[PDB]
Amino acid sequence: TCPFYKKIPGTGFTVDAFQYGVVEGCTAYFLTHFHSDHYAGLSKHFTFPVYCSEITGNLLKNKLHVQEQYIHPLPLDTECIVNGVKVVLLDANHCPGAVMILFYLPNGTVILHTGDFRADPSMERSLLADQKVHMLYLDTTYCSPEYTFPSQQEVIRFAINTAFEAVTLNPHALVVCGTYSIGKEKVFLAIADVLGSKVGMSQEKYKTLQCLNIPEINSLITTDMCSSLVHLLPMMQINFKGLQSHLKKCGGKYNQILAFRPTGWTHSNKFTRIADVIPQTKGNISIYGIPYSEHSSYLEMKRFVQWLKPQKIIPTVNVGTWKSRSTMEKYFREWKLEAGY
Ligand code: NI
C-alpha cells in the first residue's frame, strides 16, 4: 500500500508510486526520474497515464517498453494542465531527465515535490521566485551537518588532472569508470575529452545513453572497446579481482588500470580534502573513490529551504526510523527559527 508521502492531496495524483498495484483514486502517475527505487513496478503492461520529462519518457519506451500511448512527456519551465490541475516541471539538478514538480491545487494551495535534487542558487531564479509554496515534499538524503562534499566542478577538475597525468606518464594505461544507473555522466565524458578518446561500453549502456539528448553524443561514446582508452564497467566490477580480469581481456594492449568509483558521501569526507584524495593500489591497478554527488549537501539543502520558506515540510528520504525522523524535524525547526519564517 502506497505511503502518504507519495500522494498529492486534493488531486488524483501520485509521485514515484508504481510498486503498489492500482492505487485507489489515482488518475495520473507522475515519475520524477529514471532511477530504479522510483520507477519500481513499471513495464510494457502498464496501462495508466504516466507524466514525466521527455528524457524520462525516451527511457520508459526504449528500456522498459512502456507503450507510447500511455507516455505523456511535458516540456520544462512551462505551465501545463493535467486532469484539470496546473503543473510545472523544473530541472532537479540530479541525473538526466530528473524534475521537480509544482502543483497549483484547485483550492489555492501550492505544493513543490523536489523528487531527488541537488539544490543550487540557480533555482532561486526559476519559476519558483514568482509565488508562495505551502507544502515541500523534500529529498532529505543528506539532511545532517556531517554530510559535506565538494562542488561537482572541483571533483571533475581532480578526475581530469589525475587521468591526464597518469596516461601521459604511461600511454599504455587504461582508464575505467564504474556505473550502475544513469547520472554522473560528466565523470567519464570529461576524462575521455581530455584524453582524445571515445568512451567504450556495452551495448545495453550505449542504448541507455542514446535516450539522454546529450549534444554531440555520437562523437563521444562507442561500443567498439578496442578503439577506446576510457571503458565503462558495472560498479560491482570496480575491485582488484574484477579489474585484473578485465585487463586480461584487452589482449596486451594495456599494462596498467586507473579506475574511478563515483560514490556519494563516504566518511573519508569528514577528514580529507579533495586535493588530498589517494587511491587504493595493488600492483598495476589503482582505484579512486571520488565524492561526486547528485544530491544536496546539508548546507545546500538548508539554503534552499531558508530561501523558499515553506509552511510545512514532508521528508521523502530517511523516513523509516524514529531517530532519523526526529533528527530531521529538529533541523527543520532550527532553520525556521534562524531565518524567521
Ligand atoms: Ni535518484
For residues 89 and 51, what is the distance between their CA atoms, to the nearest angstrom? Answer: 10
Helices (H), 125-255: 152-169, 185-195, 203-210, 240-249
Distance 35 CA to ligand 1 centre (A): 5
DSSP 260-295: EEEES--GGGTT--GGG---EEETTEEEEEEE--SS
Which H or E run includes 137?
strand 135-138
- Compute the distance from residue 7 Cα to the ligand 1 centre, in Å: 18
Distance 48 CA to ligand 1 centre (A): 23
Q: What type of residue is 126?
A: S
Determine the distance separating the centroid of ligand 1 and the alpha carbon of 170, expressed in angstroms: 37
According to DSSP, residue 275 is labeled: G
Cα Dmax for the chain: 68
Tell which residue, 168, 145, 142, 159, has the closest CA to residue 275: 159
The CA 110 to ligand 1 mean position distance, Å, reads 24
Distance 281 CA to ligand 1 centre (A): 30
- Distance (angstroms) between ligand 1 centre and the Cα of 116 equals 5
Interval between CA 262 and ligand 1 midpoint (Å): 14
The single-letter code of the amino acid at 94 is: H
Closest CA to 118 of 135, 98, 103, 136: 98
Distance from the CA of 332 to the center of ligand 1, in angstroms? 22
Residue 314's DSSP bridge partners are 137
Method by which this entry was solved:
X-ray
Resolution in units of Å: 1.5
Distance 38 CA to ligand 1 centre (A): 7
Cα 297 to ligand 1 centroid, rounded to whole Å: 15
Where does residue 196 fall: left (phi above 0), alpha (psi -120 to 50 degrees), or beta otherwise?
left
Query: Which amino acid, 165?
Result: E
Measured at the CA of 307, the angle between CA 303 and CA 309, to 5 degrees, comes to: 120
How far away, in angstroms, is 159 Cα from ligand 1 center?
Answer: 23
Residue 45 to residue 161: CA distance in whole angstroms? 47
Rounded-to-integer distance, Cα 38 and Cα 183, Å = 14
Angstrom distances, CA of residue 281 to CA of 18, 110, 175, 229, 258? 42, 52, 14, 20, 9
Residue pair 148/297 in contact (Cβ under 8 Å)? The answer is yes
Distance 310 CA to ligand 1 centre (A): 23
* 3-class DSSP assignment, residue 202: coil
Ordered domains of the chain (ranges, CATH): 1-147+296-341 (3.60.15.10), 148-295 (3.40.50.12650)
Cα–Cα distance for residue pair 262/298, rounded to 1 Å: 19
- The Cα angle at residue 278 between residues 277 and 282, in degrees rounded to 5: 160
The CA radius of gyration of the chain, in Å to the nearest whole number, is: 22
How open is the CA angle 77-62-13, to the nearest 5 degrees? 45
Residue entry with cell 539554503? 303
How many A from CA of 267 to the centre of ligand 1? 21
Cell numbers that stand for 333 in this block:
525547526
* Residues, beta carbon < 5 Å, ion ligand 1: 35, 116
Cα–Cα distances (Å) from 112 to 1, 76, 143, 228, 295, in that order, read 23, 15, 18, 43, 17
Report helix, strand or coil for 46.
coil
Amino acid at 250: C
**244 CA distance to ligand 1 middle (Å):** 31
Quick one: 250 exposed, middle or buried, by C-beta within 10 A (0-12, 13-18, 19+)?
middle
Contact 142, 116 (CB under 8 A): no
Distance in Å, CA 34 to ligand 1 centroid: 7
Helix 298-308, helix 322-339: angle, nearest 10: 50
